[PDB]
Amino acid sequence: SIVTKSIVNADAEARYLSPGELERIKSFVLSGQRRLRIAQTLTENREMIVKKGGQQLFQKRTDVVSPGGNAYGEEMTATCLRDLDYYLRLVTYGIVAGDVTPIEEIGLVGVKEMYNSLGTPISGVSEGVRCMKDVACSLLSGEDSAEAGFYFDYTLGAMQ
Amino acid sequence: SIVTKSIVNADAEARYLSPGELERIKSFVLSGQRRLRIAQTLTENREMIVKKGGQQLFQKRTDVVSPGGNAYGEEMTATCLRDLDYYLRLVTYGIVAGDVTPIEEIGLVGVKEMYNSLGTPISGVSEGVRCMKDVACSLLSGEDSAEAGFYFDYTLGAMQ
Amino acid sequence: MQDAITAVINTADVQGKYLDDNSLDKLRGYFETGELRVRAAATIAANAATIIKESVAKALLYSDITRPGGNMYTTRRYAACIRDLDYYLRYATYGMLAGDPSILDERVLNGLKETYNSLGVPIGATVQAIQAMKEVTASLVGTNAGQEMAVYFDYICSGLS
Amino acid sequence: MQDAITAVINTADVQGKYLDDNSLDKLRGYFETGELRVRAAATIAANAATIIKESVAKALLYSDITRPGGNMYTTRRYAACIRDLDYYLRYATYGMLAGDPSILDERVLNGLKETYNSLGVPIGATVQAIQAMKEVTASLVGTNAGQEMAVYFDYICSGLS
Amino acid sequence: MQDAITAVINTADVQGKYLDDNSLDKLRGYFETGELRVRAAATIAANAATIIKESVAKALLYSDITRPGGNMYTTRRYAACIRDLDYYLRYATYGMLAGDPSILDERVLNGLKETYNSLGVPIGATVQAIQAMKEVTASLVGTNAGQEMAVYFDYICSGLS
Amino acid sequence: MQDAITAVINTADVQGKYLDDNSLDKLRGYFETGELRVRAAATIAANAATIIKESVAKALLYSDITRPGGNMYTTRRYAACIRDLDYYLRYATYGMLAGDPSILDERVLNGLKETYNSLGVPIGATVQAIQAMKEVTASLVGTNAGQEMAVYFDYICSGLS
Amino acid sequence: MQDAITAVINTADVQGKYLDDNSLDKLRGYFETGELRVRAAATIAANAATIIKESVAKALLYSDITRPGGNMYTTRRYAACIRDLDYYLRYATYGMLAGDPSILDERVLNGLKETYNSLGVPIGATVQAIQAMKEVTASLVGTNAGQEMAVYFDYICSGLS
Amino acid sequence: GYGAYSYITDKTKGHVNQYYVDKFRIASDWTKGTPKTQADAVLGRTFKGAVLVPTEGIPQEFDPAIAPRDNTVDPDPRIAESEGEVYPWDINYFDPQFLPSAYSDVNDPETVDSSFADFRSSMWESRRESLTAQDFGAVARVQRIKNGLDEKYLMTLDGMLDARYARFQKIAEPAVLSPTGTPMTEIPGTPYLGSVGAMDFIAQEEESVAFWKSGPSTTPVNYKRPSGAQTPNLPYNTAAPVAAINEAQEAQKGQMQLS
Amino acid sequence: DKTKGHVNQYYVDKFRIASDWTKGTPKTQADAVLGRTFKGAVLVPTEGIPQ
Amino acid sequence: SGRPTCGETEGTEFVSNARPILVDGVKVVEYWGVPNGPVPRLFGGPG
Amino acid sequence: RDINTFTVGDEFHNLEKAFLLNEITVQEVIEYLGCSKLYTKEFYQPYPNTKVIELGTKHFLGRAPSNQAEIRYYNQILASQGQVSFIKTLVNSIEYTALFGKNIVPYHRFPTLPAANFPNTQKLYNSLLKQSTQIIVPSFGNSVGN
Ligand SMILES: C=CC1=C(C)[C@@H](Cc2[nH]c(/C=C3N=C(/C=C4\NC(=O)[C@H](C)[C@H]4CC)C(C)=C\3CCC(=O)O)c(CCC(=O)O)c2C)NC1=O
Ligand SMILES: CCC1=C(C)/C(=C/C2=NC(=C\c3[nH]c(/C=C4\NC(=O)[C@H](C)[C@H]4CC)c(C)c3CCC(=O)O)/C(CCC(=O)O)=C2C)NC1=O
Ligand SMILES: CCC1=C(C)/C(=C/C2=NC(=C\c3[nH]c(/C=C4\NC(=O)[C@H](C)[C@H]4CC)c(C)c3CCC(=O)O)/C(CCC(=O)O)=C2C)NC1=O
Ligand SMILES: CCC1=C(C)/C(=C/C2=NC(=C\c3[nH]c(/C=C4\NC(=O)[C@H](C)[C@H]4CC)c(C)c3CCC(=O)O)/C(CCC(=O)O)=C2C)NC1=O
Ligand SMILES: CCC1=C(C)/C(=C/C2=NC(=C\c3[nH]c(/C=C4\NC(=O)[C@H](C)[C@H]4CC)c(C)c3CCC(=O)O)/C(CCC(=O)O)=C2C)NC1=O
Ligand SMILES: CCC1=C(C)/C(=C/C2=NC(=C\c3[nH]c(/C=C4\NC(=O)[C@H](C)[C@H]4CC)c(C)c3CCC(=O)O)/C(CCC(=O)O)=C2C)NC1=O
Ligand SMILES: CCC1=C(C)/C(=C/C2=NC(=C\c3[nH]c(/C=C4\NC(=O)[C@H](C)[C@H]4CC)c(C)c3CCC(=O)O)/C(CCC(=O)O)=C2C)NC1=O
């Protein structure tokens, strides 16, 4: 969160929170309701984002569903959509947090080691999350999908 | 032991044993019975090596034998040959180990400080081990006494 | 560490659920109290030196501690206690402004009782000093924010004791 | 640490004796089993990744642990878990190839139970993961070498339990 | 640490008193004995190697420790043994020349009994070695200075036992 | 336990020697101070009640401790505190009259700091109460015997702290 | 506890299987060695007193321990010492006759190292006393049964060390 | 107890729990698994689907003149195939690579000779380097002890035993503090002097790395060179410093080499 | 640790002089005089040519 | 680019997406010692 | 301790010649001592990786591990490569350069600011060599959150 980050940064320098830092927390806590609506919309539209994003993923990338592929079968495809559901939930956490700290610590720290331990191509993961970014930007406003879409952009930048 | 000289190595590199190292282990465990022949011969001929090496030591180096010398006296002379027996036994451990770790940790780690704390000239110790090297090379074959004699050479290089 | 927001995402995350209306009520509670926390942190940042001076003057001076043989008797140890008090005030402000005392668990109260029982710092006098900072601080920030700072100072005092 | 050879020189040394026929029989035993151990360590060196992948797939996946709430839920904890498994495989190979589990006493089992009971790592699941590595590894190296590897995996499991 | 002077300043300081006639009598005592302590430390500095050699020859000579399985049996353990006698002689000289055994409390006797009971070092043989250093050292420095060294070697012997 | 006599027989016994002139000088010292110890113990036996009342009246009453929420707030806790004071005074008298604080090691200070840190008894206030009993007791028995009781009370206060 | 039979039923039971030929071979091994274990326990039962007397005479007497200052100097301590040698002999006989040293894990070696390091019992001397019981006992029961007793006395010595 | 709960023992997935893994409660759903061992089996069945047979019968009696049966012969080839173990898919299959015949046998002489000769290579590298390193180190500490030992080093225990090292081995005499403590001077003006003559100039064999070269091939002849620049500046009319005159004489030294 | 270090007994010590022998004799083959058996006899290799 | 722990080719010395601010933020600061990190004193400024 | 009892002889004699000629800075001495086989045999061999962290920070920085994230950081470094990377990261850290720079031998210090640093270094430096195999700081407590 922004509170946690300000605290941590301040803690490193062993000093009280700076006026500039303090001003941001005011802007954050007053921008609250707008964000709740943003995570409310991505919360209540999750099934279309995960299914439609999964469809654009597998249609763009037939290699994963090819015989001998990681995503082959019904069970494995269900596990693949399960993970896209995870990262959509984490993005909503990052939106209400006003920072990627929740997303980064739940989802991104050590992700490459896990998917390399699973045999999963992580570029396919990033293509899946980019597909959900396109669907989720189709569900939102201009400035709103700018913001939420940039949280998706951070997860894409963590995968690549 | 030779086996240890690999597990410590790739342990500190935090990897599995290297292929090149593995070949040596195979060459070691197949060279075993020849080594046990060598340490069998130096085992069953120890009295000749200690006595005859002590004779060549005291004949080359009349310093210690003489009164006022470190080894002068019946009790003192016996101890001197007791130490030659120690090194000879250690050489045999180093032969069956396939490494001088046994020789180093039982005999060589901190040896200079001990014999300097006893007033013993350590050059006379090295001359004694060289005398036992000449006798032990007289009791073996060509390549055989090359190998065993080189273990003795390691002890000489540690004393000097 | 964690703030109140991170804690909500912890409970909602560890259930596997998304954000339901209860967690959004908790986020609304934090976002209502946000500005109050901000100005309280501003004021404490402003008058930390004054607060320390008044709480040491109330709680510690002219006693056996600053008399010789007490633990504050030298200039090095006077400085140490004064410096120590500053840390309690600073991390109590962090705990206030996060809305979650996890910071005091991580960076303050860990090993502190073993430290003071190792050195010979009196725990009693320290607790009295912290409560003096609680009263002065509550007098500066007012009623509401003084209750909030009161829970974190009392958290540190419950940690030492 | 010590191998079987070092252990023989420990007993023969600590008696003061030289090498008698019993100790030479023990070294003949080790030198007979040497090649088998070498090729087993070669195979495990080849397929470490697939051992850990298949053993995690058997023992830990699609359970409460990797579901949220579980110890392995975050990506940080998943990676630490498979890291830990790698250590168990690596040092179990060292213990096999030395012929003496003293390495596991020195560098693995020391303080590990206090560490996992400190952090919150479930010992049960760890042991079941190690036994999954035992079955997969025995499937790779075969019957005899699988008995050797099994003894050392069972040594670590006896250590944590 | 502290010498006799520092200890006087500690007691007088920690009562808040000035230096009264008693403390000045203690400082007079130390300043009378100072030169004797200096020449004693000079002679021990000169003959340290021979003190350790003669004391090992008295105390550990003709003993089972030398024989296989004893604790001095290897070259590494012999060197560690005579190394520890070097520590005892040297810190005993520091304690003599300070006039206060606080050095021995801080840097020698702390954790040493736990160390030797951990390693397997015989305490009895160690104490007899230290007493052999006490007899040889008293023979070198004479009667007075041998009494002074005698209180510090006896302090180390009382510490280990 | 042990008195000064038993301690002399301990040192003389553990050396294996009999009684030399130094140990007889120590026995003469104890037998000189004997009657002083006896009448001091008589007077403390006489005025225990008043020592406790005066020391609680100096050290503890009209403060946060007897105000609600302090540790002496309920009657049960008032009586337990005076009770504790009675034990400190009684065992301090035993320690005085033996001439050796071993009793306070065996029967008082064993586990007492774990007790008070378990219950929540303030150690500070307890030490202040014991020092109040030290001053009052020294005022009753006089200068010499007040120094002797001073040692035992300071021994218990050094034990708690 | 468990004997060899119970251990066989533990492995066969915990696999869920019945008794296969391997487990029956293990029970045949134990039932072959049974009579030898019986007569060995009979002989040790006969001459317990003389085992402890001869082993104390070899290992502990006329040394620093029974001299003043040594661990066994007072009669109370002498009797406690030989009492403990009686426990080591008794439970070593139970361990021999069960064929499984789990008894020594449950009722002897648990907390014993903490107990002797608490009291001041030297572990070195204890181990040497137990090995003296091993040599005397092996002299009474003979070669084979002395090897069996040897593994259990060495088990206790490995436990304390 | 006779039943004890070892975590080593509990294979069943109680601790790490998956709903899907389960006991075979009903006949329906064998589909999901088959038995792998003989102990896991149907009451009258075998690990494979077959009726259990006790495999004990009456051997045809033979004449006493007929030789008796041998226990260690290769089992008949037909027997193995009827159990089915020859096919790779079958569980019990034994790989041909895991045979003991696939090994180099240790008892054979030619493998021992050839493989000892394989052993010696990887060791003469590291053994050579270790020995040479010992020799370089030897030269190094002998020259270090010869150059002199400073006061602070001589106070340390290591220095004390290095001074003894030099004494017992006749390398040099090293000045050490006198049994009184005041430093052993030859001339009472300056501390720590030593006798200088005729043994400083004899070269010792322990200083030289190279034992092999023993013959100097020239004769040296000395003369005086004019020295040009490098002639040190000297103060006029005063006593020059000792160092300056030494530099003046070091500048004016010429060497001829006659082969 | 067979050697007596922890239990400090002066009387039990290793043989260092010719006079010592009266007090004790060797019990095992490994504890032996150079050229002797554990009993007092000259060592014989016990290997010969079978007829 | 060092040795990878688990999986293949990844598992190097820094875990991917780990924090520099968690390690670098927490500094070890001997007050009355050499200043490792910036250290404030409320009462440092001269009277 | 002194180098004499755990070494045969000269070992790395080169550093003595190379350091007395002042070509080699004190840091490079500390690195080449930290990366040798001798340092493996003493401190990396008989101790687990957590204890190797703790000893390594004690030797090369003069303090205890400060938080949990340094323990994970140092574990991954140790596991990923080995001791050589680990000593190179301890020496080449911002901290070691700020405190010691090029020309200062590391010394025992009493850290004040974070968590249990003062107490844990007091547990470390009050322990002798081989006084116990038991680890002083295995880890820190269960912190809520991630
Ligand atoms: C600072 C002042 C200064 C000098 C004045 C010179 C003087 C000088 N000349 C030579 C050396 C020499 N000088 C000459 C010169 C001669 N050849 C002849 O036919 C003539 C007789 C003569 C010139 C007129 C020769 C030939 C040599 C070499 C001699 C030889 O090697 O045989 C050397 C010996 C070193 C060398 O080989 O260079 C020196 C010191 N050097 C100095 O540093
Ligand atoms: C909250 C953060 C978080 C994430 C993201 C996470 C992922 C995760 N993905 C897994 C498997 C998997 N994940 C995938 C994913 C994919 N396959 C493809 O080809 C595509 C590129 C991609 C889908 C878009 C597949 C196929 C598996 C199973 C592979 C196998 O088991 O063989 C597993 C193995 C066991 C289990 O799922 O229960 C975990 C733990 N865990 C976490 O804690
Ligand atoms: C060889 C010497 C050695 C070992 C073995 C070792 C283990 C070890 N495991 C750890 C954590 C961990 N270990 C696991 C392990 C598991 N999780 C699961 O669900 C599985 C069942 C199980 C593995 C089979 C997890 C998840 C953590 C991370 C806990 C956390 O910090 O968040 C940590 C804390 C540091 C960190 O990783 O962040 C250590 C130090 N350390 C060593 O130095
Ligand atoms: C297994 C490794 C190992 C070795 C080698 C070892 C040697 C060793 N040599 C000793 C003495 C000695 N060693 C010698 C040896 C010699 N004198 C000479 O002039 C010759 C050069 C040389 C004989 C070749 C002498 C004279 C003494 C006794 C010196 C004295 O006591 O004054 C002692 C003193 C006490 C005792 O022996 O019991 C030990 C411990 N200890 C070990 O644990
Ligand atoms: C001044 C501060 C100080 C002291 C005194 C000290 C003692 C000390 N003695 C040690 C070991 C030892 N100490 C001895 C001592 C003895 N062996 C004998 O037989 C003799 C009877 C006896 C000496 C009189 C031996 C043999 C060891 C080595 C044990 C081993 O590691 O193998 C060790 C373990 C480290 C090592 O040497 O390898 C320490 C730390 N350490 C300190 O920092
Ligand atoms: C909740 C249970 C509880 C009780 C009841 C309680 C009583 C209590 N009564 C006190 C004093 C006292 N209480 C009295 C009471 C009386 N004087 C009379 O003559 C009357 C009979 C009576 C009033 C009805 C007086 C005079 C004192 C003070 C006496 C003195 O200080 O000299 C004190 C001394 C210090 C202080 O008050 O702060 C306590 C702690 N404490 C407790 O925790
Ligand atoms: C301070 C209290 C105390 C006492 C008394 C004590 C006695 C004691 N007496 C012993 C032996 C002995 N004590 C005796 C005594 C006697 N034999 C007779 O026939 C007579 C009746 C009697 C002499 C008057 C004998 C013969 C032995 C040795 C028996 C043997 O070793 O076989 C031993 C065995 C080892 C050793 O002496 O060092 C101890 C410890 N220990 C103590 O700590």
For residue C32, count CB atoms less than 10 angstroms from its CB and return exposed for 0-12, middle for 13-18, buried for 19 or more.
exposed
CB-based burial, F30-53: b 16+ in 10 Å, e otherwise? beebeeebeebbebbeebbeebbe
The answer to whether C160 faces chain F, any CB pair under 8 Å, is no
Using CA atoms, how far apart are residues G94 and G86, in angstroms rounded to an integer? 12
| Residue given tokens 């099934």 in the structure block | A47
What DSSP string describes B95-128?
HHHTSSHHHIIIIITTHHHHHHHHT--HHHHHHH
Distances (CA, A) of C1 to A95, D52, K65: 19, 33, 18
Cβ pair B8, B117 in contact under 8 A: no
Tokens representing B6?
């690999």
Kindly list the residues from chain E whose CB atom is less than 8 angstroms away from the CB atom of residue I6.
122, 124
User: Residue A58: enclosing H or E segment and its boundaries?
Assistant: helix A46-60
Cβ pair H13, H21 in contact under 8 A: yes
Cβ pair K85, J13 in contact under 8 A: yes
Using CA atoms, how far apart are residues A122 and E59, in angstroms rounded to an integer? 72
Pocket-testing residue among G63, G75, G76, ligand 7, by greatest number of atoms within 8 A of Cβ: G75
Nearest residue (CA) to ligand 6, atom 2: F74
Q: Is the CB of B135 under 6 A from ligand 4?
A: no
Cβ neighbours for G114, distance < 8 A, ≥ 6 positions apart? none
Among residues K79, K139, K67, which one has the least CA distance to residue D115?
K139
Eight-class DSSP state of H101: G
Tokens representing F139?
């005022």
Using CA atoms, how far apart are residues G152 and G104, in angstroms rounded to an integer? 8
For residue H100, count CB atoms less than 10 angstroms from its CB and return exposed for 0-12, middle for 13-18, buried for 19 or more.
exposed
Q: What's the length of chain J?
A: 47
Cβ pair H174, K51 in contact under 8 A: no
Tokens representing E78?
């012999």
Task: For residue H259, report the distance from its CA to the centre of ligand 1, in Å.
Answer: 20
Helical pair E21-46 and E48-59, crossing angle rounded to 10 deg: 80
Coil vs helix vs strand at K99: helix
Using CA atoms, how far apart are residues E83 and E108, in angstroms rounded to an integer? 13
User: Residue H254: enclosing H or E segment and its boundaries?
Assistant: strand H254-258
Strands (E), chain F: none
Distances (CA, A) of K82 to A114, D95, J12, K77: 21, 19, 11, 7
Radius of gyration of chain E (CA): 18
**Terminal CA-CA length for chain C:** 22
Among residues H16, H50, H49, which one has the least CA distance to residue H30?
H49
Neighbouring CB atoms inside 10 A of G110's CB total 12
Q: Is the CB of F80 under 6 A from ligand 6?
A: no
Instruction: Please list the alpha-helical segments (H only) found in chain H.
Output: 77-83, 109-147, 151-155, 157-168, 242-251
Tokens representing A58?
């597998």
Tokens representing H185?
């001077």
Cβ pair K112, C111 in contact under 8 A: no
Using CA atoms, how far apart are residues A115 and C2, in angstroms rounded to an integer? 28
For residue H71, count CB atoms less than 10 angstroms from its CB and return exposed for 0-12, middle for 13-18, buried for 19 or more.
exposed
Using CA atoms, how far apart are residues B153 and H131, in angstroms rounded to an integer? 8
Cα D3 vs. chain centroid, distance in angstroms? 15
Using CA atoms, how far apart are residues H155 and E127, in angstroms rounded to an integer? 25
Cβ neighbours for F137, distance < 8 A, ≥ 6 positions apart? F44, F51, F89, F92, F146, F149, F153
Residue type at E83?
R
Eight-class DSSP state of H235: -
Coil vs helix vs strand at H223: strand
Helical pair D48-59 and D75-98, crossing angle rounded to 10 deg: 120
Q: Is the CB of F143 under 6 A from ligand 6?
A: no
Using CA atoms, how far apart are residues C33 and C99, in angstroms rounded to an integer? 9
Q: What's the length of chain E?
A: 161
What DSSP string describes E37-61?
HHHHHHHHHHTHHHHHHHHHHHHTT
For residue H221, count CB atoms less than 10 angstroms from its CB and return exposed for 0-12, middle for 13-18, buried for 19 or more.
exposed
Cβ neighbours for D149, distance < 8 A, ≥ 6 positions apart? D40, D44, D92, D93, D96, D134, D137, D138, D141
For residue D132, count CB atoms less than 10 angstroms from its CB and return exposed for 0-12, middle for 13-18, buried for 19 or more.
buried
Half-sphere exposure of C88 (CA within 13 A, CB side): 31
Dihedral class, residue K65 (left if φ above 0, else alpha if ψ from -120 to 50, else beta): beta
Distances (CA, A) of G138 to B97, D87, G43, G135, H208: 33, 44, 11, 5, 61
| Residue given tokens 């005398």 in the structure block | B131
Q: Facing residues of H258 across strands?
A: H219
Q: Facing residues of H45 across strands?
A: H51
Kindly list the residues from chain B whose CB atom is less than 8 angstroms away from the CB atom of residue E74.
105-107, 109
Q: Which candidate from D2, D24, D38 shows the least CB-CB separation from B26?
A: D38
Using CA atoms, how far apart are residues D111 and K48, in angstroms rounded to an integer? 8
Cβ neighbours for E132, distance < 8 A, ≥ 6 positions apart? E54, E55, E56, E58, E59
Tokens representing F144?
């010499």
Using CA atoms, how far apart are residues I3 and G124, in angstroms rounded to an integer? 11
Dihedral class, residue K89 (left if φ above 0, else alpha if ψ from -120 to 50, else beta): alpha
Task: For residue A131, report the distance from its CA to the centre of ligand 5, in Å.
Answer: 68
Coil vs helix vs strand at H45: strand
Using CA atoms, how far apart are residues F41 and E160, in angstroms rounded to an integer? 37
Q: Facing residues of H183 across strands?
A: H177
Using CA atoms, how far apart are residues G154 and G128, in angstroms rounded to an integer? 11
Neighbouring CB atoms inside 10 A of D91's CB total 21
The nearest CA of chain J is from the CA of D48 a distance in Å of 9
Cα E46 vs. chain centroid, distance in angstroms? 16
CB-based burial, A106-131: b 16+ in 10 Å, e otherwise? bbbbbbbbbbbbbebbbebbbbbbbb
The answer to whether F63 faces chain C, any CB pair under 8 Å, is no
Q: Which ligand 1 atom lies nearest to the CA of residue H228?
A: 1
Using CA atoms, how far apart are residues B28 and B24, in angstroms rounded to an integer? 6
Residue type at F152?
Y
Using CA atoms, how far apart are residues F107 and F89, in angstroms rounded to an integer? 13
Q: Which ligand 7 atom lies nearest to the CA of residue G60?
A: 35
Tokens representing G88?
């080591």
The nearest CA of chain J is from the CA of D55 a distance in Å of 13
Neighbouring CB atoms inside 10 A of A22's CB total 17
Q: What are phi and psi of C23, to 5 degrees?
A: -65, -35
Tokens representing F98?
């033996």
Cβ neighbours for K69, distance < 8 A, ≥ 6 positions apart? J19, J22, J23, J26
CB pair distance less than 8 Å for E115 and K2: no
Tokens representing C62?
């002219």
Among residues A85, A93, A94, which one has the least CA distance to residue A53?
A85
The answer to whether A111 faces chain D, any CB pair under 8 Å, is yes
Neighbouring CB atoms inside 10 A of H56's CB total 6
Among residues E155, E160, E34, which one has the least CA distance to residue E101?
E155
Using CA atoms, how far apart are residues A152 and A132, in angstroms rounded to an integer? 8
Using CA atoms, how far apart are residues K15 and F103, in angstroms rounded to an integer? 60
Among residues E107, E109, E128, E111, which one has the least CA distance to residue E119?
E111
> Which residue on chain J is closest to B13 by alpha carbon?
J3
Helical pair D112-119 and D143-160, crossing angle rounded to 10 deg: 60
| Residue given tokens 């004190």 in the structure block | K26
Using CA atoms, how far apart are residues E91 and K82, in angstroms rounded to an integer? 39
Cα F157 vs. chain centroid, distance in angstroms? 9
| Residue given tokens 């007829």 in the structure block | I51
Coil vs helix vs strand at B140: coil
User: Residue H255: enclosing H or E segment and its boundaries?
Assistant: strand H254-258
Q: Facing residues of H51 across strands?
A: H45
Question: What are the CB-based long-range contacts (under 8 Å, 24+) for G40-46?
Answer: G40/G96, G40/G97, G40/G141, G40/G145, G40/G148, G40/G149, G41/G93, G41/G96, G41/G97, G43/G140, G43/G141, G44/G89, G44/G93, G44/G137, G44/G140, G44/G141, G44/G149, G45/G93
> Which residue on chain I is closest to D20 by alpha carbon?
I30
Neighbouring CB atoms inside 10 A of C65's CB total 19
Q: Facing residues of H255 across strands?
A: H222
Cβ pair H206, H171 in contact under 8 A: yes
Q: What's the length of chain D?
A: 161
Q: What are phi and psi of F98, to 5 degrees?
A: -80, -30
Using CA atoms, how far apart are residues C158 and C112, in angstroms rounded to an integer? 12
Pairing of strands H254-258, H219-223: antiparallel
Task: For residue A156, report the distance from its CA to the centre of ligand 6, in Å.
Answer: 72
Cα D140 vs. chain centroid, distance in angstroms? 15
User: Residue D36: enclosing H or E segment and its boundaries?
Assistant: helix D21-46
Distances (CA, A) of A53 to A19, A63, A70, A88, K36: 42, 16, 18, 11, 54
Task: For residue E58, report the distance from its CA to the centre of ligand 7, in Å.
Answer: 29
Coil vs helix vs strand at H256: strand
Task: For residue H170, report the distance from its CA to the centre of ligand 4, in Å.
Answer: 20
> Which residue on chain D is closest to A120 by alpha carbon?
D53
Residue type at E58?
K
Cβ neighbours for J14, distance < 8 A, ≥ 6 positions apart? K73, K76
Half-sphere exposure of C67 (CA within 13 A, CB side): 5
Eight-class DSSP state of I36: B
Tokens representing K118?
């003062």
Q: What are phi and psi of H45, to 5 degrees?
A: -90, -170
Cβ pair I13, I5 in contact under 8 A: no
Coil vs helix vs strand at J37: coil
Coil vs helix vs strand at H258: strand
Q: Which ligand 5 atom lies nearest to the CA of residue E91?
A: 1
Q: What angle do CA B118, B120, B123 make, to 5 degrees?
A: 145
Q: Is the CB of H258 under 6 A from ligand 1?
A: no
Cβ pair K4, B110 in contact under 8 A: yes
Cβ neighbours for C67, distance < 8 A, ≥ 6 positions apart? C73, E16
Tokens representing E15?
């009562």
Q: Compute the count of residue pairs across chains D and I with CB atoms less than 8 Å apart.
A: 4
Resolution attained, angstroms: 3.5
Instruction: Please list the alpha-helical segments (H only) found in chain F.
Output: 4-14, 21-46, 48-59, 75-98, 102-107, 112-119, 123-141, 143-160
Among residues H84, E120, E45, which one has the least CA distance to residue G124?
E120
Q: Is the CB of D84 under 6 A from ligand 3?
A: yes
Using CA atoms, how far apart are residues G71 and K17, in angstroms rounded to an integer? 53
The answer to whether H131 faces chain B, any CB pair under 8 Å, is yes
Neighbouring CB atoms inside 10 A of B128's CB total 26
Residue type at H44?
G
Q: Which candidate from D19, D44, D103 shows the least CB-CB separation from B39?
A: D19
| Residue given tokens 């693995």 in the structure block | D108
Cβ pair E2, E107 in contact under 8 A: no
Using CA atoms, how far apart are residues F50 and H254, in angstroms rounded to an integer? 105
Q: Facing residues of I42 across strands?
A: I36
Nearest residue (CA) to ligand 2, atom 40: D66
Among residues G43, G4, G44, which one has the least CA distance to residue G24?
G4
Q: Facing residues of I36 across strands?
A: I42
Task: For residue B4, report the distance from its CA to the centre of ligand 3, in Å.
Answer: 27
Q: Contact partners of B by the rule of 3+ C-beta pairs under 8 A? A: D, E, H, I, J, K
Tokens representing E42?
């000079």
What DSSP string describes G110-124?
TTHHHHHHHHT--HH
Q: Of the ligands numbered here, which is closest to the C-alpha atom of D70?
A: 3
Tokens representing H221?
């002849």
Q: Facing residues of H222 across strands?
A: H255
Residue type at E46?
A
User: Residue K95: enclosing H or E segment and its boundaries?
Assistant: helix K94-99
User: Residue D42: enclosing H or E segment and its boundaries?
Assistant: helix D21-46
Using CA atoms, how far apart are residues G110 and G114, in angstroms rounded to an integer? 9
Tokens representing H227?
């020295």
Neighbouring CB atoms inside 10 A of J46's CB total 4
CB pair distance less than 8 Å for D75 and A117: no
Residue type at F89?
L
